[PDB]
Protein backbone atom coordinates (compact mmCIF):
# COMPACT_ATOMS: atom_id res chain seq x y z
CA UNK A 1 0.00 0.00 0.00
CA UNK A 2 0.97 3.60 -0.71
CA UNK A 3 -1.12 6.67 0.05
CA UNK A 4 -1.03 10.38 -0.74
CA UNK A 5 -2.78 13.57 0.36
CA UNK A 6 -2.94 16.86 -1.53
CA UNK A 7 -5.18 19.84 -2.22
CA UNK A 8 -6.00 22.13 -5.14
CA UNK A 9 -5.16 25.41 -3.40
CA UNK A 10 -8.89 26.19 -3.05
CA UNK A 11 -9.70 24.19 0.08
CA UNK A 12 -10.50 20.86 -1.59
CA UNK A 13 -9.04 17.60 -0.27
CA UNK A 14 -7.72 14.70 -2.34
CA UNK A 15 -6.64 11.51 -0.57
CA UNK A 16 -5.77 8.39 -2.53
CA UNK A 17 -4.12 5.01 -2.01
CA UNK A 18 -3.02 1.83 -3.71
CA UNK A 19 -4.19 -1.39 -2.08
CA UNK A 20 -1.40 -3.92 -2.62
CA UNK A 21 -2.22 -7.58 -1.99
CA UNK A 22 -1.64 -11.06 -3.38
CA UNK A 23 -5.27 -11.78 -4.30
CA UNK A 24 -8.76 -10.30 -4.57
CA UNK A 25 -9.60 -8.14 -1.55
CA UNK A 26 -13.40 -8.24 -1.91
CA UNK A 27 -13.61 -4.46 -1.61
CA UNK A 28 -16.87 -2.55 -2.09
CA UNK A 29 -17.86 1.10 -1.95
CA UNK A 30 -19.65 1.56 1.39
CA UNK A 31 -21.69 4.62 2.40
CA UNK A 32 -22.30 5.17 6.12
CA UNK A 33 -25.22 7.58 6.66
CA UNK A 34 -25.83 9.96 9.56
CA UNK A 35 -28.88 7.98 10.74
CA UNK A 36 -27.09 4.63 10.96
CA UNK A 37 -27.19 3.03 14.42
CA UNK A 38 -23.56 2.48 15.34
CA UNK A 39 -22.08 -0.65 16.92
CA UNK A 40 -19.03 0.75 18.68
CA UNK A 41 -17.42 -1.71 21.14
CA UNK A 42 -16.23 0.99 23.57
CA UNK A 43 -18.51 3.86 22.61
CA UNK A 44 -15.89 5.77 20.62
CA UNK A 45 -18.38 6.02 17.73
CA UNK A 46 -21.71 6.81 19.46
CA UNK A 47 -23.32 8.28 16.32
CA UNK A 48 -22.42 9.26 12.76
CA UNK A 49 -21.74 13.00 12.82
CA UNK A 50 -20.54 13.11 9.20
CA UNK A 51 -21.62 10.73 6.44
CA UNK A 52 -18.78 8.55 5.19
CA UNK A 53 -17.91 7.05 1.80
CA UNK A 54 -15.02 4.76 0.98
CA UNK A 55 -13.80 1.28 0.14
CA UNK A 56 -14.37 -1.50 2.63
CA UNK A 57 -16.55 -4.43 3.61
CA UNK A 58 -19.51 -4.86 5.96
CA UNK A 59 -19.41 -7.39 8.80
CA UNK A 60 -21.92 -7.57 11.66
CA UNK A 61 -23.73 -4.53 10.23
CA UNK A 62 -20.52 -2.52 10.70
CA UNK A 63 -18.51 -0.74 7.96
CA UNK A 64 -14.90 -1.95 7.97
CA UNK A 65 -13.20 0.72 5.89
CA UNK A 66 -9.86 0.40 4.13
CA UNK A 67 -9.98 4.11 3.28
CA UNK A 68 -12.76 6.69 3.36
CA UNK A 69 -13.66 10.36 3.44
CA UNK A 70 -16.56 12.23 4.99
CA UNK A 71 -18.94 15.05 4.03
CA UNK A 72 -16.84 17.65 5.90
CA UNK A 73 -13.57 17.29 3.96
CA UNK A 74 -11.63 14.80 6.11
CA UNK A 75 -10.33 11.43 4.91
CA UNK A 76 -8.28 8.49 6.16
CA UNK A 77 -6.57 5.44 4.67
CA UNK A 78 -5.41 2.34 6.52
CA UNK A 79 -2.22 0.83 5.13
CA UNK A 80 -0.70 -2.54 5.99
CA UNK A 81 1.69 -2.42 8.96
CA UNK A 82 2.29 -5.99 10.26
CA UNK A 83 5.32 -6.48 12.46
CA UNK A 84 5.02 -2.91 13.76
CA UNK A 85 1.34 -2.36 14.53
CA UNK A 86 0.61 -3.65 18.03
CA UNK A 87 -2.71 -2.65 19.55
CA UNK A 88 -3.67 -2.58 23.21
CA UNK A 89 -5.17 -5.81 24.50
CA UNK A 90 -7.85 -4.09 26.59
CA UNK A 91 -9.71 -0.80 26.81
CA UNK A 92 -8.45 1.81 29.29
CA UNK A 93 -10.80 3.64 31.65
CA UNK A 94 -11.18 7.29 30.69
CA UNK A 95 -9.43 6.90 27.34
CA UNK A 96 -11.04 7.09 23.91
CA UNK A 97 -10.97 3.35 23.23
CA UNK A 98 -11.22 2.69 19.49
CA UNK A 99 -11.40 -0.82 18.11
CA UNK A 100 -8.80 -1.22 15.37
CA UNK A 101 -11.43 -2.14 12.77
CA UNK A 102 -13.42 1.03 13.54
CA UNK A 103 -10.53 3.52 13.63
CA UNK A 104 -11.14 4.91 10.10
CA UNK A 105 -14.88 5.04 10.80
CA UNK A 106 -14.04 6.90 14.02
CA UNK A 107 -11.84 9.44 12.20
CA UNK A 108 -14.31 10.08 9.39
CA UNK A 109 -17.63 9.88 11.25
CA UNK A 110 -16.61 12.10 14.18
CA UNK A 111 -14.38 14.96 13.02
CA UNK A 112 -14.26 17.64 10.33
CA UNK A 113 -10.55 18.55 10.32
CA UNK A 114 -7.10 17.24 11.15
CA UNK A 115 -7.00 19.76 14.02
CA UNK A 116 -10.03 18.06 15.58
CA UNK A 117 -8.72 14.50 15.10
CA UNK A 118 -5.25 15.35 16.38
CA UNK A 119 -6.72 16.84 19.56
CA UNK A 120 -8.99 13.82 20.05
CA UNK A 121 -6.01 11.49 19.53
CA UNK A 122 -4.46 12.82 22.76
CA UNK A 123 -6.51 10.27 24.77
CA UNK A 124 -6.88 7.52 22.14
CA UNK A 125 -6.15 3.86 22.81
CA UNK A 126 -6.51 1.52 19.83
CA UNK A 127 -7.67 -1.91 21.02
CA UNK A 128 -7.30 -5.35 19.45
CA UNK A 129 -11.05 -6.05 19.40
CA UNK A 130 -11.78 -8.13 16.29
CA UNK A 131 -15.09 -7.58 14.53
CA UNK A 132 -15.65 -11.36 14.67
CA UNK A 133 -13.83 -14.69 14.46
CA UNK A 134 -13.49 -14.54 10.66
CA UNK A 135 -11.61 -11.21 10.65
CA UNK A 136 -8.91 -10.67 13.27
CA UNK A 137 -7.72 -7.10 13.71
CA UNK A 138 -5.86 -5.95 10.62
CA UNK A 139 -2.38 -4.69 11.50
CA UNK A 140 -2.33 -1.18 10.04
CA UNK A 141 -1.16 2.37 10.32
CA UNK A 142 -3.11 5.35 9.02
CA UNK A 143 -2.70 8.57 7.06
CA UNK A 144 -5.34 11.21 7.83
CA UNK A 145 -5.73 14.39 5.81
CA UNK A 146 -7.86 17.43 5.16
CA UNK A 147 -7.28 20.19 2.61
CA UNK A 148 -4.62 21.72 4.88
CA UNK A 149 -2.29 18.93 6.01
CA UNK A 150 -1.81 15.24 6.77
CA UNK A 151 -0.91 13.31 9.90
CA UNK A 152 0.20 9.70 10.33
CA UNK A 153 -1.05 7.51 13.18
CA UNK A 154 0.97 4.49 14.31
CA UNK A 155 0.02 2.39 17.34
CA UNK A 156 2.98 0.17 18.22
CA UNK A 157 4.41 -1.73 21.19
CA UNK A 158 5.16 1.53 23.05
CA UNK A 159 1.76 3.06 22.28
CA UNK A 160 0.30 5.82 20.13
CA UNK A 161 2.45 7.90 17.78
CA UNK A 162 1.11 10.83 15.74
CA UNK A 163 3.34 12.43 13.10
CA UNK A 164 3.23 15.60 11.04
CA UNK A 165 3.33 14.10 7.54
CA UNK A 166 5.09 16.98 5.80
CA UNK A 167 5.66 14.86 2.67
CA UNK A 168 1.97 13.91 2.45
CA UNK A 169 2.70 10.22 1.69
CA UNK A 170 2.66 6.89 3.49
CA UNK A 171 3.71 3.36 2.64
CA UNK A 172 4.12 0.28 4.83
CA UNK A 173 6.82 -0.78 7.32
CA UNK A 174 8.86 0.40 9.16
CA UNK A 175 7.65 3.34 11.26
CA UNK A 176 7.15 6.86 9.97
CA UNK A 177 10.14 8.26 11.85
CA UNK A 178 12.41 5.82 10.02
CA UNK A 179 11.00 6.72 6.59
CA UNK A 180 11.26 10.46 7.30
CA UNK A 181 14.95 10.20 8.20
CA UNK A 182 15.45 7.99 5.14
CA UNK A 183 14.39 10.91 2.93
CA UNK A 184 17.73 12.54 3.81
CA UNK A 185 19.46 9.79 1.78
CA UNK A 186 18.12 11.25 -1.50
CA UNK A 187 19.04 14.94 -1.29
CA UNK A 188 20.57 14.99 -4.79
CA UNK A 189 17.43 13.66 -6.53
CA UNK A 190 15.96 16.41 -8.70
CA UNK A 191 13.79 16.76 -11.82
CA UNK A 192 16.03 19.53 -13.16
CA UNK A 193 17.74 19.23 -16.53
CA UNK A 194 21.33 20.12 -15.63
CA UNK A 195 23.66 22.53 -17.31
CA UNK A 196 26.56 20.69 -18.93
CA UNK A 197 28.77 18.95 -16.38
CA UNK A 198 32.54 18.65 -16.71
CA UNK A 199 33.99 15.67 -14.82
CA UNK A 200 37.78 16.05 -14.89
CA UNK A 201 37.96 16.88 -18.60
CA UNK A 202 34.91 14.92 -19.82
CA UNK A 203 31.99 16.99 -21.11
CA UNK A 204 28.96 15.10 -19.79
CA UNK A 205 25.47 15.96 -21.04
CA UNK A 206 22.29 14.03 -20.14
CA UNK A 207 20.97 11.35 -22.44
CA UNK A 208 17.63 13.08 -21.85
CA UNK A 209 15.25 13.83 -18.99
CA UNK A 210 15.78 12.38 -15.53
CA UNK A 211 19.58 12.57 -15.23
CA UNK A 212 19.37 14.13 -11.75
CA UNK A 213 16.51 11.83 -10.67
CA UNK A 214 19.09 9.02 -10.49
CA UNK A 215 19.04 7.30 -7.11
CA UNK A 216 15.26 7.25 -6.68
CA UNK A 217 14.65 3.50 -6.27
CA UNK A 218 12.19 1.64 -8.47
CA UNK A 219 11.75 -1.56 -6.45
CA UNK A 220 8.59 -2.57 -4.60
CA UNK A 221 10.15 -2.53 -1.11
CA UNK A 222 8.15 -0.37 1.29
CA UNK A 223 10.99 2.10 2.13
CA UNK A 224 11.63 2.46 -1.61
CA UNK A 225 7.98 3.21 -2.40
CA UNK A 226 7.93 5.80 0.39
CA UNK A 227 10.91 7.61 -1.13
CA UNK A 228 9.63 7.27 -4.70
CA UNK A 229 6.13 8.44 -3.75
CA UNK A 230 7.55 11.33 -1.70
CA UNK A 231 9.59 12.49 -4.71
CA UNK A 232 6.82 12.18 -7.32
CA UNK A 233 4.17 13.66 -5.03
CA UNK A 234 6.33 16.62 -4.00
CA UNK A 235 7.19 17.55 -7.60
CA UNK A 236 3.75 17.04 -9.16
CA UNK A 237 2.51 20.55 -10.05
CA UNK A 238 -0.62 21.70 -8.27
CA UNK A 239 -3.84 21.51 -10.28
CA UNK A 240 -7.04 23.54 -9.97
CA UNK A 241 -9.64 21.37 -11.74
CA UNK A 242 -11.32 18.18 -10.58
CA UNK A 243 -10.30 16.31 -13.75
CA UNK A 244 -6.61 17.17 -13.46
CA UNK A 245 -6.59 16.37 -9.74
CA UNK A 246 -8.22 12.99 -10.33
CA UNK A 247 -5.60 12.31 -13.01
CA UNK A 248 -2.89 13.39 -10.57
CA UNK A 249 -3.94 10.75 -8.04
CA UNK A 250 -3.91 7.82 -10.44
CA UNK A 251 -0.68 8.85 -12.19
CA UNK A 252 1.14 9.41 -8.90
CA UNK A 253 0.01 6.05 -7.53
CA UNK A 254 0.81 4.22 -10.77
CA UNK A 255 4.40 5.34 -10.14
CA UNK A 256 4.46 3.18 -6.99
CA UNK A 257 2.03 0.45 -8.06
CA UNK A 258 2.85 -3.26 -8.12
CA UNK A 259 2.32 -5.47 -11.17
CA UNK A 260 2.29 -9.22 -11.69
CA UNK A 261 5.57 -11.11 -11.40
CA UNK A 262 7.84 -8.42 -9.98
CA UNK A 263 7.77 -9.11 -6.21
CA UNK A 264 6.63 -12.28 -4.44
CA UNK A 265 5.51 -12.86 -0.87
CA UNK A 266 6.61 -15.81 1.24
CA UNK A 267 3.79 -17.84 -0.29
CA UNK A 268 5.30 -17.31 -3.73
CA UNK A 269 2.28 -15.32 -4.90
CA UNK A 270 3.05 -11.92 -6.40
CA UNK A 271 1.88 -8.77 -4.64
CA UNK A 272 -0.08 -6.50 -6.98
CA UNK A 273 -1.93 -3.20 -6.79
CA UNK A 274 -5.43 -4.68 -6.64
CA UNK A 275 -7.24 -1.33 -6.56
CA UNK A 276 -6.43 2.38 -6.47
CA UNK A 277 -8.98 4.57 -4.70
CA UNK A 278 -9.36 8.34 -4.40
CA UNK A 279 -11.65 10.48 -2.25
CA UNK A 280 -12.40 14.01 -3.49
CA UNK A 281 -14.05 16.43 -1.08
CA UNK A 282 -14.70 18.91 -3.91
CA UNK A 283 -17.25 16.59 -5.53
CA UNK A 284 -17.85 14.38 -2.46
CA UNK A 285 -16.99 11.46 -4.72
CA UNK A 286 -14.96 8.27 -4.42
CA UNK A 287 -13.02 7.30 -7.56
CA UNK A 288 -11.21 4.03 -8.22
CA UNK A 289 -9.78 1.62 -10.75
CA UNK A 290 -8.54 -1.96 -10.43
CA UNK A 291 -5.73 -4.19 -11.63
CA UNK A 292 -8.16 -5.66 -14.18
CA UNK A 293 -9.43 -2.32 -15.51
CA UNK A 294 -7.66 1.07 -15.41
CA UNK A 295 -10.85 2.96 -16.33
CA UNK A 296 -11.82 5.25 -13.45
CA UNK A 297 -15.14 4.44 -11.80
CA UNK A 298 -16.87 6.77 -9.37
CA UNK A 299 -19.60 6.88 -6.73
CA UNK A 300 -20.97 10.24 -5.59
CA UNK A 301 -22.28 10.57 -2.05
CA UNK A 302 -25.06 12.76 -3.49
CA UNK A 303 -26.43 9.68 -5.29
CA UNK A 304 -27.14 7.83 -2.03
CA UNK A 305 -29.18 8.38 1.12
CA UNK A 306 -26.40 9.94 3.18
CA UNK A 307 -29.04 10.84 5.79
CA UNK A 308 -30.57 7.35 5.72
CA UNK A 309 -30.41 4.76 8.47
CA UNK A 310 -28.67 1.76 6.87
CA UNK A 311 -25.21 1.07 5.51
CA UNK A 312 -25.28 1.19 1.70
CA UNK A 313 -23.10 -1.34 -0.10
CA UNK A 314 -23.02 0.37 -3.48
CA UNK A 315 -23.63 -1.81 -6.56
CA UNK A 316 -24.03 0.92 -9.30
CA UNK A 317 -21.14 3.23 -10.34
CA UNK B 1 9.50 6.29 -24.90
CA UNK B 2 9.59 2.66 -23.78
CA UNK B 3 8.38 -0.32 -25.80
CA UNK B 4 7.81 -4.03 -25.22
CA UNK B 5 7.14 -7.15 -27.32
CA UNK B 6 5.60 -10.39 -26.09
CA UNK B 7 3.38 -13.30 -27.12
CA UNK B 8 0.78 -15.56 -25.50
CA UNK B 9 2.37 -18.89 -26.45
CA UNK B 10 -0.32 -19.37 -29.11
CA UNK B 11 1.26 -17.41 -31.96
CA UNK B 12 -0.31 -14.06 -31.08
CA UNK B 13 1.77 -10.88 -31.00
CA UNK B 14 1.53 -7.98 -28.56
CA UNK B 15 3.65 -4.86 -29.12
CA UNK B 16 3.11 -1.80 -26.95
CA UNK B 17 4.83 1.49 -26.16
CA UNK B 18 4.71 4.65 -24.10
CA UNK B 19 5.06 7.85 -26.09
CA UNK B 20 6.89 10.30 -23.83
CA UNK B 21 6.81 13.99 -24.76
CA UNK B 22 6.48 17.46 -23.24
CA UNK B 23 3.19 18.38 -24.94
CA UNK B 24 0.24 17.05 -26.93
CA UNK B 25 1.45 15.03 -29.91
CA UNK B 26 -1.74 15.23 -31.99
CA UNK B 27 -1.73 11.46 -32.48
CA UNK B 28 -4.61 9.61 -34.14
CA UNK B 29 -5.34 5.99 -35.03
CA UNK B 30 -4.57 5.59 -38.75
CA UNK B 31 -5.54 2.59 -40.87
CA UNK B 32 -3.57 2.12 -44.08
CA UNK B 33 -5.48 -0.30 -46.35
CA UNK B 34 -4.01 -2.51 -49.06
CA UNK B 35 -5.66 -0.44 -51.80
CA UNK B 36 -4.03 2.85 -50.80
CA UNK B 37 -1.89 4.49 -53.50
CA UNK B 38 1.48 5.07 -51.88
CA UNK B 39 3.65 8.18 -51.95
CA UNK B 40 7.09 6.64 -51.46
CA UNK B 41 9.86 9.14 -52.34
CA UNK B 42 12.36 6.47 -53.47
CA UNK B 43 9.93 3.65 -54.27
CA UNK B 44 10.60 1.63 -51.11
CA UNK B 45 6.84 1.30 -50.58
CA UNK B 46 5.38 0.70 -54.08
CA UNK B 47 2.13 -0.78 -52.73
CA UNK B 48 0.54 -1.85 -49.45
CA UNK B 49 0.96 -5.62 -49.21
CA UNK B 50 -0.44 -5.88 -45.65
CA UNK B 51 -3.01 -3.56 -44.12
CA UNK B 52 -1.63 -1.45 -41.27
CA UNK B 53 -3.15 0.00 -38.10
CA UNK B 54 -1.50 2.15 -35.47
CA UNK B 55 -0.98 5.56 -33.93
CA UNK B 56 0.29 8.40 -36.07
CA UNK B 57 -0.53 11.48 -38.11
CA UNK B 58 -1.31 12.07 -41.78
CA UNK B 59 0.54 14.63 -43.90
CA UNK B 60 0.42 14.95 -47.70
CA UNK B 61 -1.94 11.94 -47.72
CA UNK B 62 0.88 9.88 -46.19
CA UNK B 63 0.60 7.92 -42.90
CA UNK B 64 3.41 8.92 -40.52
CA UNK B 65 3.26 6.17 -37.91
CA UNK B 66 4.66 6.33 -34.41
CA UNK B 67 3.88 2.61 -33.96
CA UNK B 68 1.76 0.14 -35.90
CA UNK B 69 1.06 -3.49 -36.70
CA UNK B 70 -0.22 -5.26 -39.79
CA UNK B 71 -2.69 -7.98 -40.78
CA UNK B 72 0.10 -10.59 -40.84
CA UNK B 73 1.24 -10.36 -37.21
CA UNK B 74 4.19 -7.95 -37.57
CA UNK B 75 4.48 -4.70 -35.63
CA UNK B 76 6.92 -1.83 -35.20
CA UNK B 77 7.36 1.19 -32.92
CA UNK B 78 9.58 4.22 -33.45
CA UNK B 79 11.08 5.55 -30.22
CA UNK B 80 12.90 8.85 -29.72
CA UNK B 81 16.64 8.64 -30.40
CA UNK B 82 18.07 12.19 -30.87
CA UNK B 83 21.81 12.51 -30.53
CA UNK B 84 22.30 8.95 -31.81
CA UNK B 85 20.06 8.57 -34.86
CA UNK B 86 21.73 9.92 -37.99
CA UNK B 87 20.19 9.15 -41.38
CA UNK B 88 21.81 9.26 -44.80
CA UNK B 89 21.68 12.75 -46.27
CA UNK B 90 20.74 11.41 -49.73
CA UNK B 91 19.40 8.29 -51.39
CA UNK B 92 21.97 5.70 -52.48
CA UNK B 93 21.69 4.33 -56.01
CA UNK B 94 20.99 0.60 -55.96
CA UNK B 95 19.89 0.49 -52.32
CA UNK B 96 16.43 0.19 -50.77
CA UNK B 97 16.11 3.87 -49.85
CA UNK B 98 13.50 4.28 -47.09
CA UNK B 99 12.58 7.78 -45.99
CA UNK B 100 12.78 8.08 -42.21
CA UNK B 101 9.11 9.02 -41.87
CA UNK B 102 8.02 5.95 -43.86
CA UNK B 103 10.20 3.31 -42.16
CA UNK B 104 7.39 1.94 -39.91
CA UNK B 105 5.06 2.01 -42.92
CA UNK B 106 7.71 0.15 -44.93
CA UNK B 107 8.10 -2.47 -42.19
CA UNK B 108 4.39 -3.07 -41.63
CA UNK B 109 3.14 -2.74 -45.21
CA UNK B 110 5.73 -4.98 -46.89
CA UNK B 111 6.57 -7.90 -44.61
CA UNK B 112 4.85 -10.69 -42.68
CA UNK B 113 7.58 -11.74 -40.21
CA UNK B 114 10.75 -10.56 -38.52
CA UNK B 115 12.63 -13.04 -40.73
CA UNK B 116 11.41 -11.21 -43.83
CA UNK B 117 12.20 -7.66 -42.71
CA UNK B 118 15.61 -8.73 -41.36
CA UNK B 119 16.54 -10.19 -44.74
CA UNK B 120 15.28 -7.04 -46.47
CA UNK B 121 17.16 -4.70 -44.11
CA UNK B 122 20.51 -5.84 -45.54
CA UNK B 123 20.03 -3.42 -48.48
CA UNK B 124 18.26 -0.59 -46.63
CA UNK B 125 19.48 2.99 -46.42
CA UNK B 126 17.32 5.25 -44.25
CA UNK B 127 17.28 8.75 -45.74
CA UNK B 128 16.67 12.14 -44.15
CA UNK B 129 13.86 13.04 -46.56
CA UNK B 130 11.29 15.04 -44.55
CA UNK B 131 7.62 14.64 -45.38
CA UNK B 132 7.35 18.43 -45.80
CA UNK B 133 8.75 21.72 -44.49
CA UNK B 134 6.60 21.57 -41.34
CA UNK B 135 7.89 18.19 -40.10
CA UNK B 136 11.63 17.46 -40.13
CA UNK B 137 12.63 13.81 -39.96
CA UNK B 138 12.05 12.55 -36.43
CA UNK B 139 15.26 11.11 -34.96
CA UNK B 140 14.28 7.59 -33.95
CA UNK B 141 15.21 3.97 -33.52
CA UNK B 142 12.77 1.09 -33.87
CA UNK B 143 11.69 -2.14 -32.23
CA UNK B 144 10.14 -4.66 -34.64
CA UNK B 145 8.42 -7.83 -33.48
CA UNK B 146 6.28 -10.77 -34.43
CA UNK B 147 4.95 -13.54 -32.18
CA UNK B 148 8.40 -15.19 -32.31
CA UNK B 149 10.96 -12.48 -31.52
CA UNK B 150 11.93 -8.82 -31.58
CA UNK B 151 14.73 -6.95 -33.33
CA UNK B 152 15.96 -3.40 -32.83
CA UNK B 153 16.99 -1.22 -35.77
CA UNK B 154 19.31 1.73 -35.16
CA UNK B 155 20.60 3.93 -37.99
CA UNK B 156 23.51 5.99 -36.69
CA UNK B 157 26.74 7.55 -37.93
CA UNK B 158 27.99 3.96 -38.32
CA UNK B 159 25.07 3.05 -40.58
CA UNK B 160 22.39 0.42 -40.03
CA UNK B 161 22.60 -1.99 -37.10
CA UNK B 162 20.11 -4.78 -36.35
CA UNK B 163 20.11 -6.31 -32.87
CA UNK B 164 18.56 -9.48 -31.49
CA UNK B 165 16.35 -7.96 -28.76
CA UNK B 166 16.36 -10.94 -26.42
CA UNK B 167 14.90 -8.85 -23.57
CA UNK B 168 12.01 -7.70 -25.78
CA UNK B 169 12.19 -4.05 -24.64
CA UNK B 170 13.45 -0.75 -25.99
CA UNK B 171 13.84 2.72 -24.52
CA UNK B 172 15.71 5.78 -25.79
CA UNK B 173 19.42 6.72 -25.86
CA UNK B 174 22.10 5.42 -25.98
CA UNK B 175 22.46 2.47 -28.37
CA UNK B 176 21.05 -0.99 -27.80
CA UNK B 177 24.44 -2.62 -27.29
CA UNK B 178 25.11 -0.24 -24.42
CA UNK B 179 21.77 -1.00 -22.75
CA UNK B 180 22.19 -4.75 -23.23
CA UNK B 181 25.60 -4.71 -21.53
CA UNK B 182 24.13 -2.49 -18.80
CA UNK B 183 21.70 -5.30 -17.90
CA UNK B 184 24.68 -7.14 -16.41
CA UNK B 185 24.81 -4.46 -13.67
CA UNK B 186 21.57 -5.77 -12.12
CA UNK B 187 22.20 -9.50 -11.78
CA UNK B 188 21.07 -9.61 -8.13
CA UNK B 189 17.63 -8.11 -8.82
CA UNK B 190 14.98 -10.75 -8.11
CA UNK B 191 11.27 -10.96 -7.22
CA UNK B 192 12.06 -13.77 -4.76
CA UNK B 193 11.08 -13.49 -1.12
CA UNK B 194 13.93 -14.47 1.26
CA UNK B 195 12.66 -15.77 4.61
CA UNK B 196 15.70 -14.61 6.61
CA UNK B 197 19.28 -13.50 5.98
CA UNK B 198 21.96 -13.63 8.69
CA UNK B 199 24.43 -10.74 8.36
CA UNK B 200 27.23 -11.35 10.86
CA UNK B 201 24.94 -12.15 13.80
CA UNK B 202 21.96 -9.99 12.78
CA UNK B 203 18.80 -11.85 11.76
CA UNK B 204 17.52 -9.81 8.81
CA UNK B 205 13.95 -10.38 7.59
CA UNK B 206 12.36 -8.36 4.75
CA UNK B 207 9.90 -5.62 5.59
CA UNK B 208 7.75 -7.15 2.85
CA UNK B 209 7.82 -7.91 -0.84
CA UNK B 210 10.57 -6.57 -3.08
CA UNK B 211 13.61 -6.94 -0.81
CA UNK B 212 15.66 -8.59 -3.58
CA UNK B 213 14.39 -6.20 -6.26
CA UNK B 214 16.51 -3.45 -4.65
CA UNK B 215 18.83 -1.83 -7.19
CA UNK B 216 16.23 -1.57 -9.96
CA UNK B 217 16.27 2.19 -10.68
CA UNK B 218 13.09 4.24 -10.48
CA UNK B 219 14.20 7.41 -12.27
CA UNK B 220 13.08 8.55 -15.73
CA UNK B 221 16.55 8.36 -17.34
CA UNK B 222 16.47 6.28 -20.51
CA UNK B 223 19.01 3.63 -19.34
CA UNK B 224 17.08 3.32 -16.07
CA UNK B 225 13.79 2.74 -17.89
CA UNK B 226 15.46 0.13 -20.09
CA UNK B 227 16.63 -1.79 -17.01
CA UNK B 228 13.34 -1.32 -15.16
CA UNK B 229 11.29 -2.36 -18.20
CA UNK B 230 13.58 -5.33 -18.86
CA UNK B 231 13.06 -6.59 -15.30
CA UNK B 232 9.28 -6.08 -15.16
CA UNK B 233 8.74 -7.47 -18.66
CA UNK B 234 10.91 -10.54 -18.07
CA UNK B 235 9.15 -11.42 -14.81
CA UNK B 236 5.53 -10.80 -15.87
CA UNK B 237 3.88 -14.25 -16.06
CA UNK B 238 2.74 -15.27 -19.51
CA UNK B 239 -1.00 -14.96 -20.13
CA UNK B 240 -3.29 -16.76 -22.58
CA UNK B 241 -6.33 -14.46 -22.87
CA UNK B 242 -6.74 -11.22 -24.77
CA UNK B 243 -7.99 -9.42 -21.65
CA UNK B 244 -5.01 -10.41 -19.49
CA UNK B 245 -2.52 -9.66 -22.26
CA UNK B 246 -4.02 -6.20 -22.78
CA UNK B 247 -3.79 -5.64 -19.02
CA UNK B 248 -0.18 -6.85 -19.10
CA UNK B 249 0.78 -4.17 -21.64
CA UNK B 250 -0.63 -1.22 -19.73
CA UNK B 251 0.59 -2.37 -16.30
CA UNK B 252 4.09 -3.05 -17.64
CA UNK B 253 4.33 0.33 -19.35
CA UNK B 254 2.85 2.18 -16.36
CA UNK B 255 5.89 0.88 -14.47
CA UNK B 256 8.17 2.98 -16.72
CA UNK B 257 5.78 5.85 -17.49
CA UNK B 258 6.52 9.51 -16.78
CA UNK B 259 4.16 11.79 -14.87
CA UNK B 260 4.02 15.55 -14.48
CA UNK B 261 6.78 17.30 -12.55
CA UNK B 262 9.27 14.46 -12.14
CA UNK B 263 11.74 15.07 -15.01
CA UNK B 264 12.20 18.29 -16.97
CA UNK B 265 13.60 18.74 -20.46
CA UNK B 266 16.06 21.48 -21.37
CA UNK B 267 13.10 23.78 -22.01
CA UNK B 268 11.99 23.33 -18.39
CA UNK B 269 8.81 21.55 -19.49
CA UNK B 270 8.17 18.15 -17.92
CA UNK B 271 8.29 15.00 -20.01
CA UNK B 272 5.17 12.85 -19.62
CA UNK B 273 3.71 9.66 -21.05
CA UNK B 274 1.23 11.30 -23.39
CA UNK B 275 -0.24 8.01 -24.60
CA UNK B 276 0.27 4.26 -24.28
CA UNK B 277 -0.61 2.13 -27.30
CA UNK B 278 -0.78 -1.62 -27.88
CA UNK B 279 -1.15 -3.63 -31.09
CA UNK B 280 -2.72 -7.09 -30.76
CA UNK B 281 -2.51 -9.48 -33.71
CA UNK B 282 -4.93 -11.91 -32.04
CA UNK B 283 -7.81 -9.44 -32.44
CA UNK B 284 -6.20 -7.15 -35.07
CA UNK B 285 -6.94 -4.31 -32.66
CA UNK B 286 -5.05 -1.21 -31.55
CA UNK B 287 -5.65 -0.31 -27.89
CA UNK B 288 -4.58 2.88 -26.15
CA UNK B 289 -5.03 5.25 -23.25
CA UNK B 290 -3.73 8.76 -22.57
CA UNK B 291 -2.29 10.88 -19.80
CA UNK B 292 -5.72 12.47 -19.42
CA UNK B 293 -7.71 9.22 -19.31
CA UNK B 294 -6.46 5.76 -18.23
CA UNK B 295 -9.51 3.97 -19.68
CA UNK B 296 -8.42 1.73 -22.55
CA UNK B 297 -9.91 2.61 -25.93
CA UNK B 298 -9.62 0.42 -29.00
CA UNK B 299 -10.01 0.35 -32.78
CA UNK B 300 -10.52 -2.98 -34.53
CA UNK B 301 -9.23 -3.22 -38.09
CA UNK B 302 -12.28 -5.36 -38.95
CA UNK B 303 -14.49 -2.30 -38.42
CA UNK B 304 -12.79 -0.62 -41.39
CA UNK B 305 -12.16 -1.57 -45.01
CA UNK B 306 -8.69 -3.09 -44.76
CA UNK B 307 -8.81 -3.37 -48.56
CA UNK B 308 -10.13 0.16 -49.12
CA UNK B 309 -8.28 2.79 -51.12
CA UNK B 310 -8.02 5.68 -48.64
CA UNK B 311 -6.19 6.28 -45.40
CA UNK B 312 -8.67 6.15 -42.51
CA UNK B 313 -8.11 8.52 -39.59
CA UNK B 314 -10.30 7.09 -36.85
CA UNK B 315 -12.38 9.36 -34.62
CA UNK B 316 -14.72 8.59 -31.72
MG1 LIG C 1 -11.02 -6.47 -7.17
MG1 LIG D 1 -11.98 10.42 26.63
MG1 LIG E 1 -2.79 13.35 -26.01
MG1 LIG F 1 4.70 -6.36 1.20
Numbering used by the authors:
A (entry chain A): 2 to 318
B (entry chain B): 2 to 317
Task: Copy text verbatim from the article accompanying this structure deposition.
Bile salt hydrolases (BSHs) catalyze the amino acid deconjugation reactions required to liberate free bile acids for subsequent and successive modifications and metabolism. The BSHs belong to the N-terminal nucleophile hydrolase (Ntn-hydrolase) superfamily, which is characterized by an αββα core structure that is subject to autoactivation. Here, we identify and describe the BSH from a common member of the Plains bison microbiome, Arthrobacter citreus (BSHAc). Steady-state kinetic analyses demonstrated that BSHAc is a broad-spectrum hydrolase with a preference for glycine-conjugates and deoxycholic acid (DCA).
To assess conserved and divergent structure-function relationships between BSHAc and other BSHs, we crystallized the enzyme and obtained a three-dimensional structure using X-ray diffraction data. A model of BSHAc was refined at a resolution 2.0 Å. The asymmetric unit of the BSHAc crystals contained a dimer. In BSHAc, a 36-amino acid loop extending from α3 and terminating in α4 contains a β-sheet as well as a proposed substrate selectivity motif. At a higher level, this dimer-swapped (DS) loop also contributes to the tetrameric biological assembly of BSHAc. In BSHAc, the interface between the loop-swapped dimers covers an area of ∼2100 Å2 whereas the total area of interaction between protomers in the tetramer is ∼7200 Å2. In the inhibitor-free BSHAc, residues Trp22 and Phe26 appear in a T-shaped π-stacking arrangement whereas the presence of the inhibitor alters their interaction.
